[PDB]
Amino acid sequence: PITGLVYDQRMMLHHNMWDSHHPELPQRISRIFSRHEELRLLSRCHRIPARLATEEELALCHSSKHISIIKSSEHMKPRDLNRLGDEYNSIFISNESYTCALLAAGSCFNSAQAILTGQVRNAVAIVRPPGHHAEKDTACGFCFFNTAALTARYAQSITRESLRVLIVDWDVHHGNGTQHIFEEDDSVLYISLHRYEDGAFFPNSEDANYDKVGLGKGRGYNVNIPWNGGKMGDPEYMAAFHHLVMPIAREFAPELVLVSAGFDAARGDPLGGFQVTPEGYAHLTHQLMSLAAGRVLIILEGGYNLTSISESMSMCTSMLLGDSPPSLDTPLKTSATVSINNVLRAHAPFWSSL
Ligand SMILES: [K+]
Ligand SMILES: [K+]
Ligand SMILES: [Zn+2]
Predict the structure, then answer these.
(1) Contact, 174 vs 208, CB < 8 A?
(2) Between the CA of residue 24 and those of 51, 92, 143, 217, 305, what are the distances in Å?
(3) What's the CA angle centered on 147, arms 125 and 205, to 5 degrees?
(4) How many CB atoms lie within 10 A of CB 98?
(5) Using omega within 30 degrees of 0 as the cis cutoff, is the peptide bond preceding 26 cis?
(6) Residue 61 to residues 26, 28, 65, 194, 279: CA-CA distances in angstroms?
(7) Which of 111, 203, 216, 293 is in the most buried spot, having the most CB atoms within 10 Å?
(8) Angle, in degrees to the nearest 10, between helices 147-158 and 97-116
(9) Closest ligand (CA of 28)
């Protein structure tokens, strides 16, 4: 009954060499790690080693062009790093970025392998840079390679090709790259909750709306839960899990759960504007633990208030370790009722549980 934990200080080497205060900070991961130490969660976990992803593994989801361009940045002079970063939507690059992206993905592969070999029941991955905005062919939104999507394909590569992987993306932003990578796929169920604001919120695409349900054999296996016009928090997220996430997930019957666990919907985040609490994140984690015989891998995505992400992800690890769910302190914001009902209208044709 072991919980794994992967953390490697070398992932702090990725940095913004022009803006030391850019919110995707190296100390995001060291702060989360430190809070696990203070709460004495670290010694209750088995340490899973980091490793570099291989180029062959990156090619599970990304084009060889994209791999080669990010790879080339390791030897790039500052002016060229600045210019290359500016060719993407919201990317900064340093000479260490490629290696850190490789480390984040490989750390998650090792964690998924530890779960799927029965060496640990579940695991938490304290990694950066994040992944869920990265597309097959391009970097986006602080993300170079799509760690969670690659981990889903990696898991299938060591088990069977059609292994049912659920990805729950509770980062406040839509994971455009994860949706696109699996949009035609019925073996990977993508469920995202995100601030949407009728397409005005990053990443600024109507691809994130509730009516994008998947394509081809993937029709029904893409679930977007978009928030509009309100400061959403625990009641809205609990209601979305109750009416949507958990009924769909149970019907899908995943063999592995990956959480694209951004903590930028947390109270205090400078970018998300929401107010999910650490206790809320613990309850979402505990609900997901009922799936896939407990095989849950929690993967850090966004989240930019250092205190908020440290308390929030530590509470998630406490849940993985088997601790009792904390006590939770309200009627939904009206637009959140509308959002949930819109998703129910979009997906009840595909899911008998709805
Ligand atoms: K999301
Ligand atoms: K899908
Ligand atoms: Zn985010």
Answers:
(1) yes
(2) 22, 10, 10, 36, 10
(3) 120
(4) 23
(5) no
(6) 26, 26, 12, 23, 34
(7) 111
(8) 40
(9) 3
Confirm if 187 and 149 have CB atoms less than 8 A apart: no
Residue for token pair 């950066």? 128
Residue 224 phi, psi dihedral angles, 5° rounding: -105, 125
Specify the 3-state DSSP secondary structure of 297: strand
Triad 305, 308, 311: Cα angle to 5°:
145
Query: With DSSP H G I counted as helix, E B as strand and the rest as coil, what are the percentages for the chain, rounded to 5?
Result: 45, 15, 40
Q: Rg of the chain's alpha carbons, rounded to an integer?
A: 18
Distance 354 CA to ligand 3 centre (A): 28
CA of residue 252 to ligand 2 center, whole Å: 11
Residue of 36, 66, 132, 133 with catalytic role: 133
In the chain, the amino acid numbered 288 is L
Write out the two tokens for 279.
């206790």
Q: How many other CB atoms are there within 10 angstroms of residue 40's CB atom?
A: 8
For 341, the token pair is: 């009902």
